[PDB]
From a paper:
The reliance on the PMF and ATP homeostasis thus highlights the importance of the mycobacterial proton-pumping cytochrome bcc-aa3 supercomplex, which consists of a bcc menaquinol reductase (complex III, CIII) and an aa3 oxidase (complex IV, CIV) that are tightly associated. M. tuberculosis cytochrome bcc forms a dimeric assembly with endogenous menaquinone/menaquinol bound at the quinone/quinol-binding pockets. MK/MKH2 are part of the Q-cycle hypothesis and essential for electron transfer in the cytochrome bcc complex.
TB47, also currently being evaluated in preclinical studies, has been suggested to target the QcrB of cytochromes bcc from M. tuberculosis and M. ulcerans. Three hydrogen bond interactions are observed involving the side chains of QcrBThr313, QcrBGlu314, and QcrAHis375. QcrBTyr161, QcrBLeu171, QcrBGly175, QcrBAla179, QcrBLeu180, QcrBThr184, QcrBMet187, QcrBLeu194, QcrBSer304, QcrBGly305, and QcrBMet342 also contribute to TB47 binding, largely through hydrophobic interactions. There is no density linking TB47 and QcrBTyr164. However, after addition of TB47, the values of turnover number for the hybrid supercomplex reduced to 5.1 ± 2.9 e-s–1 (mean ± SD, n = 4), a similar value that was observed when Q203 binds. A mutation in TB47-resistant M. smegmatis (M. tuberculosis: H195Y) is close to the Qp-binding site. The binding of TB47 to M. tuberculosis cytochrome bcc also induces very similar conformational changes in the Qp-binding pocket to those seen for Q203 (rmsd of 0.454 Å for all Ca atoms). Differences in binding are due to the different ethyl group and methyl moieties in the head groups of Q203 and TB47.
Residue numbers in the entry:
A (entry chain J): 13 to 157
B (entry chain F): 10 to 561
C (entry chain H): 1 to 139
D (entry chain D): 25 to 100
E (entry chain G): 18 to 203
F (entry chain N): 276 to 495
G (entry chain I): 1 to 56, 69 to 79
């Protein structure tokens, strides 16, 4: 009873079957591919060496920023053992949230470091680049447990 | 509600993910990929042989080759290009997209599939491994005429390997055909009757019937030839009717072969046209009947290859080839009608299909010109014939195969091939091809027969050979963009996170996830026509599809 | 199945017509009489299509309607349990290797290689046929 | 053990599963040098040295590609 | 679901048709080179002993009925009748091929050879391939019996038995054709 | 078995030969198959000699040192492996060759080297029966001696890891039975069979690997 | 016909044609969206990227900073 914007159709299962016109894409990420790849292996190999999902958020936080960040953290598959990094380029605000299960592993000694590195890299206009730096430092900080 | 994703899908895959799955596999998708890759390797080998031939044929005089080496070159070129690249690519496309199109989880016999693939590969490797013999590979023609392939003439050890490799490959092809017929007949979705399945599937069924009719007789002829070579079996002596017997048997095999490698690509292009024309396929049942007619007629024209022997009944075969010329015409007109008054967009598959149309029309015109005996009395065994069958072969296999690759790459990978590289590739191929093979009509009309390694400067036709070799080198350079595009776009390249990346699709394969799961389906739609995915993605269109389906 | 049988009957009719016409047109008007090499191929391709069509016809007459042959039907009709489709197996590549050994032993006239190839083909085919029927080991 | 990760090699704590990469790189270079020097004492022919140089060039190209891709972080 | 028309049956039928085309090629080889040799086209050193060609044909024809009785006992779920009938069929097929080998020996003894004549070539090449098909059928019989021995009897075994049975029927009738062409028409 | 094959097959018919005389020779001069590698190494080693003051170092010296190096590297392997891996504990349970990819690859490389050396010893027989040039076989051996071992190493490593992954897949899920169903909303599943306990919704709980082989066919 | 110029054409025409066709086609714009530059506002939909690595709502800490 939703809109299904001109091509989507709900199947006999819950799956949606979307389409695309011959001359467009289906991602629309305003970043180059060769930086998406770098952010991806950062996010994967740093999560291997720390036993904790690392996430990244870029949308707006038009409220109490920490409230909204911990509202968002409930969307990671295992939020209790996860580390999220939120960024709002309009409000120019950085927010790092933890989980209850990931703590006592050297996290708060590393969150301000990551925030400072992300800010120092953002002050020139490098979004993906600062995200990479912050993920690197926080993943190198947290210990496996 | 937000929903977690990845910045970019994974590029390659874990270590040890493929090599053992490659040996024990039984799913048709991996086997189709293997088919395609090895067939393109063999295509590259054959093309290299052709480039050697061209660079010798320019500049009168034997610069770096010999007569023996030239004969081996054109023999192996013809053999590889016809039997180790086209006949298996047919089954490659079949194994790729037939079970998806009929809505089945697998092929009928899943281990016979792998058996067929491995038989093909090892037979090809056996037949090619005659070049490491000090005497060389087979040196007779591709056709292996009657007393020249005896034991007295052609005594080397390359002809034996030739014969045995062909036998093994033929066994593999017969098994593949059996599997395809059984799959199309038995395993089918619970809603679709046989007059709702796509045209590609019908062409594959008919081609499999032709394979079953044609290949066993070739195996019989080859066993007779091997008996004659290794036991002195007096089967093909000219003292008996041994010279014309071989020709009758071989051509009864060999014309159904060209129609076998022609029909499924007609299917491919007929399946690509409506997606980019935004229209239904014009004359469904008409196309089915034309396919059946071509199939029935293809076995009773075998002797239009033996006009110059003076030993056949000319009016019969001449008239019946004139007859087989018609259904191809109705097929062509149905394609043009499907493109008529639509909304055309020229992405790479549509571009390659239009190129196919043009090239095949010219080739078929030259062929129907060739079909009259008093004209074949002059142009046979010349370069006119070479230009003709190169037009038809190229325009069909090469162009329709590139179209099929650019069309079904996402449905098998989840990525998208680049389009600028695709356009560059198409234009290079088109220009080089039409510049390498056009002057050969004139080159062969004036006396220059096929299979000559040298000629004299006092003769004419020394500039036309230079133009042809320039074109051949352009065609050779035209393959770098394609392999670069495939090498880059398989790992990187814009991912596909939806069904049907070419909107307005049909055929029930664009109704499942872009890389299909194992067993190909998580749910099926209700089937009412031959465009089920189109009616699934645009439910507000069935009233208009049923209302105005008969204006014309 | 009703349409497959009709297809094969059409093909058999045309092939028989062509065979008879060719035979009687080369009995006269030809250099040496009946041609004897295309005639045979034509009668026996007629026989091929005839065998297949007759089998399909019998199976169709001995069968009730099927969700595939039937229009008007829905996906809840075919709900059930299909046959047995073999998962992973490695015997095909060994069969192909054995057959290739026998073939290369027949190309170069080497009888010992032909014997070895035939033995390997028998062994590999036995392995393929018995793969899903060997019981647990007896200890 | 010296160390690899279990998602790469599932049985990493049951047996030796890692060999350093410098061994493989320098071994490839040494084998290429052996192929190149194997054409000393040219015995009346040059069909063989074409093959020698081709195989050596292919080996060097593979080693160079691997080294360059590892140096830029495209592999691990 | 299971779409009652069996799958193995369709596969075996289409493959049998292809093999018929193979034998078509062999027949076409034989008929040419018979229109060439004029007069006594079987050369003088050959004489086809009919006193031994008929018994083997009759034992093959009887083996057909034996195989049919076997598949009859198979379609109802009892294996021992199948085993008995198929052992009988195997025995008499072996006897047929042994008699054929004996005729080959006595024919080459004082006459035709493959490199000696054209008739000898076409004769040996038309009958030896049929002999090879018979030997393949015997191997199939042995394999099927072992498979029935090694596990429980289910419908799949019945399907295997049926398809082997009518493959053997095919080889039998094609032999009937070969024999009627070679020995009686001449 | 030994009696049968000593009665039915002929070996070393010395009477077809003659007594030894330093002036006559024949064409097949091979030793038994356990010295063929020594002969092949002597055949495919290039002619590198050194001539300095009043002396000469011929080519077969190379064969001598290579032979000695092989015979010295064979008995000293366990100490090399324990020095390189650094594992000095007692062991009474064996390893499956698929759990130790590096050692399996080393062994496969050594076996490939041995096979190349052994086939390079029957040059004459191979080039005569299979129609190949003799110089071609010499160069094929001389190049294979360098490019076949590493290729075999690479393939064996990847193959071992593939086998490990195939084991982990049947540990996580159950044994594939090969039966297909259609699931009235047109879905195809394949009816796995669990090896242990099951959870609330029918999926089996994954097991842990214990170094023992796992069944792959339902009839076993 | 003047062996030098035959070799010259055969070696030069294909590569020249490749050059013109590449400069014609490979210098256009792809369908990829052009990079986002932080001087200007952010209009794209919200983005959430997970790690996916370890297979299978009480907060433990936090931090902040505003550039
Ligand atoms: C409509 C669809 C279109 C279809 C395709 C279009 C057709 C266009 C033509 C193709 C154009 C160019 C192709 C470029 C390839 C693209 C590369 C890519 O990124 O794709 C990766 C892509 C991703 O693979 P993956 O499963 O996701 O994970 C790979 C793992 O990371 C790693 O897996 P692993 O660790 O288990 O090992 C895999 C191993 C595989 O090893 C082999 O295959 C060895 C044999 C190949 C070379 C033999 C030549 C001698 O790979 C390697 O050996 C490493 C490098 C390859 C060596 C090549 C030497 C270069 C000189 O691979 C494929 O999917 C390819 C599918 C099948 C291809 C192989 C088919 C071979 C058939 C049988 C071979 C047996 C021959 C025996 C005779 C000779 C004895 C050796
Ligand atoms: C000439 C070339 C001969 C081609 C061989 C015949 C191909 C037949 C394909 C048609 C149907 C395909 C099929 O049923 O799949 C079975 C199976 C495919 O397994 P799948 O794909 O997993 O599907 C399983 C089915 O659902 C269910 O399959 P299933 O497990 O229920 O088994 C069905 C049945 C298979 O049903 C049959 O097709 C019986 C046909 C009688 C075999 C007669 C062939 C002898 C050739 C004449 C020699 C010249 O299996 C049997 O009952 C035992 C068959 C014994 C085969 C004997 C071959 C001996 C050849 C050695 C010759 C040496 C002597 C000459 C010197 O393929 C085979 O077992 C046939 C062996 C092919 C090896 C190629 C030989 C080279
Ligand atoms: C040029 C060739 C040179 C010939 C050399 C000399 C020939 C002598 C034969 C070789 C060794 C003879 C074996 C003596 C044992 C016989 C006693 C017996 O019946 O034990 C049953 C025995 C069951 O053993 P089990 O301990 O109870 O394990 C049962 C499990 O289900 C185990 O089940 P599974 O899942 O682990 O797999 C079972 C596997 C087990 O069978 C084998 O592994 C035997 C092959 C091992 C040789 C070493 C491989 C080296 C390759 C590298 O067999 C297969 O995979 C199927 C292959 C078909 C074998 C029979 C075909 C005979 C071809 C005749 C031509 O099954 C067999 O071994 C039968 C193989 C021999 C057939 C009977 C003899 C007939 C000889 C010719 C007749 C004319
Ligand atoms: C952005 C991309 C685009 C860029 C464009 C181009 C960029 C550069 C251009 C430069 C020129 C390019 C030319 C090459 C083209 C590349 C194409 C290619 O490779 O395939 C793409 C691609 C290559 O993958 P990749 O991205 O390079 O990733 C590689 C691995 O992921 C990760 O590799 P890995 O870290 O795992 O390293 C593996 C390798 C390391 O990589 C290498 O360095 C390669 C070295 C090659 C030669 C080395 C031989 C060593 C010999 C020494 C002798 C013994 C010492 O290690 C080995 O296994 C080599 C074996 C050496 C064993 C030696 C161990 C000795 C032990 C002690 C022995 C001491 C005693 C001696 C006694 C001797 C006799 C007993 O293929 C695939 O991904 C999968 C292919 C799937 C199917 C395709 C097959 C189609 C076949 C058609 C038929
Ligand atoms: C893959 C394909 C392929 C195809 C499709 C064809 C198609 C045809 N071929 Fe060709 N042919 C070969 C491959 C192919 N051929 C090969 C490989 C050889 C020789 C090889 C060898 O000898 O070594 C060969 C040789 C060959 C010969 C003998 C050459 C000889 O002298 O040696 C002849 C004529 O007898 C012939 C005829 C035809 C005809 C009549 C068609 C017809 O199918 C085509 C009809 C097509 C049309 C496009 C008509 C278009 C229709 C309309 C537009 C309506 C127009 C109506 C009128 C003009 C009436 N072919
Ligand atoms: C399906 C088939 C097919 C295809 C695609 C081709 C492709 C080509 N053919 Fe071929 N040809 C035949 C089928 C085919 N041919 C047949 C049947 C005959 C006659 C048979 C005979 O007489 O017996 C024949 C004969 C034939 C001749 C004349 C032989 C004779 O003298 O009579 C010539 C050249 O004039 C020729 C040219 C070409 C050219 C230039 C291509 C170009 O299309 C190919 C361009 C290809 C490439 C250059 C490959 C690219 C290669 C490189 C990139 C090298 C890279 C190398 C490695 C990586 C290994 N063909
Ligand atoms: C090809 C198969 C063709 C026919 C098969 C049927 C065999 C028919 C058997 C009857 C033979 C006969 O009776 O002919 C008597 C002659 C007297 O010739 P001779 O000179 O005077 O004697 C001096 C002898 N040196 O011997 C012969 O030719 C010897 C006959 C050779 C045996 C047949 C070969 C079988 C090999 C099978 C191939 C398998 C390869 C598979 C790989 C894909
Ligand atoms: C790398 C594999 C090579 C495949 C086969 C290549 C064949 C080369 C042929 C040239 C060698 C010499 C031929 C005979 C002598 C001349 O004259
Ligand atoms: C280890 C390889 C050493 C190669 C040395 C080559 C010596 C050449 C002698 C001349 O003289
Ligand atoms: Cu001709």
């Amino acid at each position: 009873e939703l809109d299904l914007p001109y091509g989507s159709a709900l199947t006999s299962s819950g799956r949606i079957s979307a389409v695309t016109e011959p001359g467009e894409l289906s991602v629309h990420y305003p970043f180059p591919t060769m930086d998406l790849v770098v952010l991806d292996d950062a996010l994967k190999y740093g999560s291997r060496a720390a036993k904790a999902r690392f996430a990244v958020y870029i949308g707006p936080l038009g409220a109490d920023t920490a409230a909204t960040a911990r509202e968002i953290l409930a969307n990671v598959p295992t939020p209790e053992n996860a580390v999220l990094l939120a960024v709002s380029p309009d409000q120019r605000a950085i927010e790092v949230v933890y989980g209850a299960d990931v703590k006592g592993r050297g996290i708060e000694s590393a969150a301000p470091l990551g925030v400072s590195a992300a800010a120092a890299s953002f002050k020139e206009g490098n979004l993906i680049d600062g995200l990479i730096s912050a993920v690197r430092v926080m993943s190198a900080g947290v210990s496996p447990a | 509600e937000l929903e977690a994703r990845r910045p970019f899908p994974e590029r390659m895959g874990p270590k040890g993910n493929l090599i053992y799955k490659l040996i024990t596999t039984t799913d048709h998708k991996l086997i189709g990929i293997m088919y395609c890759v090895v067939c393109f390797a063999f295509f590259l080998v054959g093309g290299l042989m052709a480039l050697f031939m061209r660079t010798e044929l320019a500049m009168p005089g034997l610069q770096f080759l010999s007569n023996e080496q030239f004969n081996q070159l054109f023999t192996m070129h013809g053999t590889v290009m016809l039997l180790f690249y086209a006949t298996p690519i047919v089954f490659g496309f079949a194994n790729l997209v037939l079970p998806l199109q009929i809505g089945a989880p697998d092929v009928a016999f899943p281990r016979l599939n792998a058996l067929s693939f491995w038989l093909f590969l090892f037979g090809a490797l056996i037949a090619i491994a005659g070049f490491i013999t000090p005497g060389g590979a087979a040196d007779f023609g591709w056709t292996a005429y009657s007393p020249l392939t005896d034991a007295i003439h052609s005594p080397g050890a390359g002809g034996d390997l030739w014969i045995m490799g062909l036998a093994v490959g033929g066994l593999g092809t017969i098994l593949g055909g059996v599997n395809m017929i059984t799959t199309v007949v038995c395993m089918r979705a619970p809603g679709m009757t046989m007059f709702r399945m796509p045209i590609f599937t019908w062409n594959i069924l008919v081609t499999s019937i032709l394979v079953l009719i044609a290949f066993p007789i070739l195996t019989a002829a080859l066993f007779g030839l091997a008996a004659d070579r290794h036991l002195g079996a007096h089967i093909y002596d000219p003292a008996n009717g041994g010279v014309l017997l071989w020709q009758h048997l071989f051509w009864f095999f060999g014309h159904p072969e060209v129609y076998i490698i022609a029909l499924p690509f007609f299917g491919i292009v007929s399946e690509i046209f409506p997606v980019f024309s935004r229209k239904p396929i014009f004359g469904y049942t008409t196309l089915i009947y034309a396919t059946l007619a071509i199939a029935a007629l293809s076995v009773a024209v075998w002797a239009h290859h033996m006009y110059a022997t003076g030993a056949v009944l000319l009016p019969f075969f001449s008239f019946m080839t004139f007859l087989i010329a018609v259904p191809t015409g109705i097929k062509f007109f149905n394609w043009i009608g499907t493109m008529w008054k639509g909304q055309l967009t020229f992405e790479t598959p549509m571009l390659f299909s239009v190129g196919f149309l043009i090239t095949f029309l010219l080739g078929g015109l030259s062929g129907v010109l060739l079909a009259s005996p008093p004209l074949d009395f002059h142009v046979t065994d010349s370069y006119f014939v070479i230009a003709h069958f190169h037009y038809v072969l190229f325009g069909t296999i090469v162009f329709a195969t590139y179209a099929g690759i650019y069309f079904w790459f996402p449905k098998m990978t989840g990525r998208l091939l680049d389009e600028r590289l695709g356009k560059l590739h198409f234009w290079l191929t088109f220009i080089g091809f039409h510049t390498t093979f056009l002057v050969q009509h004139w080159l062969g009309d004036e006396g220059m027969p096929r299979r000559y390694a040298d000629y004299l400067p006092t003769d004419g036709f020394t500039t036309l050979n230079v133009i042809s070799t320039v074109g051949a080198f352009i065609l050779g350079v035209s393959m770098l963009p394609f392999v670069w595009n495939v090498f880059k776009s398989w790992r990187y390249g814009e991912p596909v996170t939806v069904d049907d990346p070419w909107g307005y699709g049909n055929s029930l394969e664009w109704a499942t996830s872009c890389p299909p799961p194992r067993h190909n389906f998580t749910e099926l739609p209700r089937i009412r026509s031959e465009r089920p995915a189109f009616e699934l993605h645009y439910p507000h269109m069935v009233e208009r599809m049923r209302a105005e389906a008969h204006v014309g | 199945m009703h349409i497959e049988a009709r297809l094969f009957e059409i093909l058999t009719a045309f092939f028989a017509l062509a065979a008879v016409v060719y035979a009687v047109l080369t009995a006269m008007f030809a250099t040496g009489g009946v041609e004897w090499a295309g005639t045979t191929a034509l009668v026996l391709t007629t026989g091929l299509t005839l065998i297949t069509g007759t089998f399909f016809r019998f199976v169709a007459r001995r069968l009730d309607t099927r969700p595939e042959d039937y229009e008007d039907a829905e996906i809840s009709d075919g709900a059930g349990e299909l046959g047995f489709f073999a998962p992973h197996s490695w015997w095909p590549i060994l069969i192909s290797l054995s057959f290739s050994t026998a073939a290369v032993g027949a190309a170069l006239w080497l009888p010992w290689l032909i014997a070895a190839g035939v033995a390997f083909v028998i062994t590999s085919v036995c392995g393929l046929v018995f793969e899903y029927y060997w019981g647990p080991e007896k200890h | 053990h010296t160390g690899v990760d279990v998602e790469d090699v599932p049985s990493a704590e049951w047996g030796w599963s890692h060999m350093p990469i410098g061994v493989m790189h320098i071994g490839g270079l040494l084998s290429a040098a052996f192929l190149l020097v194997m054409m000393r004492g040219n015995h009346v022919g040059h069909v063989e040295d074409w093959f020698l140089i081709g195989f050596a060039a292919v080996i060097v190209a593979l080693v160079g590609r691997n080294w360059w891709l590892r140096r830029r972080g495209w592999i691990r | 679901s299971l779409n009652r028309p069996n799958m193995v049956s369709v596969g075996t039928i289409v493959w049998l048709s292809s093999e018929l085309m193979f034998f078509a090629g062999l027949f076409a080889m034989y008929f040419t080179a018979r229109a060439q040799a004029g007069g006594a086209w079987p050369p003088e050193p050959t004489e086809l002993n009919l006193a031994l060609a008929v018994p083997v044909t009759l034992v093959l024809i009887a083996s057909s009925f034996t195989c049919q009785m076997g598949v009859f006992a198979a379609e109802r779920g009892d294996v021992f009748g199948l085993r008995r009938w198929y052992v009988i069929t195997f025995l008499m097929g072996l006897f047929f091929v042994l008699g054929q080998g004996y005729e080959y020996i006595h024919l080459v003894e004082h006459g035709t050879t493959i490199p000696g004549s054209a008739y000898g070539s076409v004769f040996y090449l038309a009958t030896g391939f049929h002999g090879l098909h018979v030997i393949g059928g015997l191997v199939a019989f042995v394999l099927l019996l072992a498979r029935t021995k090694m596990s429980k009897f289910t419908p799949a075994q019945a399907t295997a038995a049926i398809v082997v049975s009518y493959y053997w029927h095919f080889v039998d009738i094609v032999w009937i054709a070969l024999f009627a062409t070679i020995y009686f028409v001449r | 078995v030994l009696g049968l094959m000593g009665g039915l097959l002929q070996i070393n018919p010395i009477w077809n030969l003659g007594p030894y005389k330093p002036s006559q020779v024949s064409a097949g001069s091979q030793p038994d198959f356990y010295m063929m590698w020594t002969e092949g190494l002597a055949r495919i080693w290039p002619p590198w000699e050194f001539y300095f003051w009043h002396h000469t170092i011929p080519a077969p010296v190379w064969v001598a040192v290579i032979m000695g190096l092989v015979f010295v590297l064979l008995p000293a392997y366990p100490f090399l492996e324990k020095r390189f891996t650094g594992d000095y504990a007692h062991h009474n349970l064996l390893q499956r060759p698929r759990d130790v990819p590096v050692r399996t690859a080393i062994g496969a490389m050594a076996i490939a080297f041995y096979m190349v050396l052994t086939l390079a010893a029957m040059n004459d027989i191979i080039a005569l029966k299979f129609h190949i040039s003799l110089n071609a076989t010499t160069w094929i051996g001389r190049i294979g001696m360098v490019i076949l071992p590493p290729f075999v190493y690479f393939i064996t490593y990847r193959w071992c890891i593939g086998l490990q992954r195939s084991d982990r897949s049947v540990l996580e899920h159950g044994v594939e039975t090969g039966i297909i169903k259609r699931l009235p909303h047109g879905a195809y599943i394949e009816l796995h069979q669990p090896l242990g306990p099951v959870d609330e919704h029918g999926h089996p709980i994954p097991l842990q690997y214990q170094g023992a082989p796992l069944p792959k066919r339902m009839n076993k | 016909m003047s062996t030098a110029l035959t070799h010259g054409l055969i070696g030069g025409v294909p590569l020249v044609l490749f050059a013109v066709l590449a400069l014609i086609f490979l210098t256009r714009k792809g369908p990829h969206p052009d990079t986002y530059k932080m001087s200007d506002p952010w209009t794209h939909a919200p983005i959430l990227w997970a790690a996916e690595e370890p297979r299978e709502v009480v907060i433990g800490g936090g931090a902040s900073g505003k550039w």
